[PDB]
Swiss-Prot record, chain A:
Its EC number is 3.2.1.14. This is Chitinase B. Residues 40-423 form the GH18 domain. It catalyses: Random endo-hydrolysis of N-acetyl-beta-D-glucosaminide (1->4)-beta-linkages in chitin and chitodextrins. The active site is at residue 142.
Amino acid sequence: TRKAVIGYYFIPTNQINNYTETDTSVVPFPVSNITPAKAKQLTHINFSFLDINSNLECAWDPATNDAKARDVVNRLTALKAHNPSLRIMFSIGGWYYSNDLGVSHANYVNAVKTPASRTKFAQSCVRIMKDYGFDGVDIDWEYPQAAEVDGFIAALQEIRTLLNQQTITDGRQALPYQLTIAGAGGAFFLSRYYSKLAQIVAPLDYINLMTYDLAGPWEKVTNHQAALFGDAAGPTFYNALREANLGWSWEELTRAFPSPFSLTVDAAVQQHLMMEGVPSAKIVMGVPFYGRAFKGVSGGNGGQYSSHSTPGEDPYPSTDYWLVGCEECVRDKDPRIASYRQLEQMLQGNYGYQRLWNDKTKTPYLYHAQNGLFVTYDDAESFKYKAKYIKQQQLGGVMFWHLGQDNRNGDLLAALDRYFNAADYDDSQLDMGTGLRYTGVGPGNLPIMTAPAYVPGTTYAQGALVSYQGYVWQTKWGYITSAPGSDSAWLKVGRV
Amino acid sequence: RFXXX
């Protein structure tokens, strides 16, 4: 089946109110930039972002000029005339609105609190969907805390029920209304709801892993923000998942969650696959269409893993725009982030940047020998490995943040589409390398092994293997006399 | 992310 290619499309409320397709200084990336050729390369466009107001219902930002909004949305839905598989989803949330200290956080916690609030919220979701002409709902709450998870799950189940009803009522059997969420792409935020992943993913068509922002000025040493695989020379992190309320034994926790570990895209994907009831087909790998920059770094390894002097303070202090060549950074008042479009232009300039490649993480990075600058980002080359990985692991597809950051020729989007569907692209020889793989093993990814059937009344020594209840077991110590699942001395290590 | 985003 075709791999999903989900592009978030974000347009600031101020750009909506001043929408125009003839002045890039007002609207850098209007919808017209999405030609029919590009509409065909996408399977989903996630319009971002809608919020949840005080009436605990899905709603546009109060400052939004509604007529301008519908006009922009209508331009997006008009693109469906060029691609019968394309869906224009709308995303509820985002960091600004939903983070713990976000301007609308309480509305999220309250919307999912009760059956009544959940029914009211779900109905507003479907209402907004049919009202503006969207094709599905994406929930991007960053992020629900463990105590709000059961409500979160129930809310998703309710939206699922209403959407399936709407699909029938609207004869959309060919292009069913969908439900997805942007999920965490790193163990720390993932730990908030990890124990209930199976319940969270059940009502979804896809869980879009935000497998980016895994590095940034908020960390001590520079690092790749979306390394596919790990580099032993880079920093490692505490595996927060081992502290999840899973109810697993020490032995199970340790094998599923090695710590410290390399915070990579492969780690996030494997961490989801380790849980039972989380199908590979629903996992979507997120990739960034932007890079993160660090200043005051040291050479030696191209700027990688160096200490730096980048204000991790969000609303970038000073008007000191140290990110040379990045005119966009000036426009947006922040030299710590730049779109691939801007980065490409900085590279072809003579701003003193050198593009290097890390063959372990399979990602590029820029090093400014002078000024001491380092930029972690992704490009068409890193997307080759990520696309091959998506195919090998049988993931549902790729997602990205965000469409408006691609270059004018739409090279990053074209590359993703090419790697998945071009008849003349052949990656059978692409070498995935020796970067560190996340080796955690859990209930959802037990390996096939083979073992004799456990014999009741028999005593086995330490290390013995046996089959029982459709699984293969190993003894954690010696002189065992009870049965698997009935004696803590046995560790389930394989299936069939 | 992670206040700007």
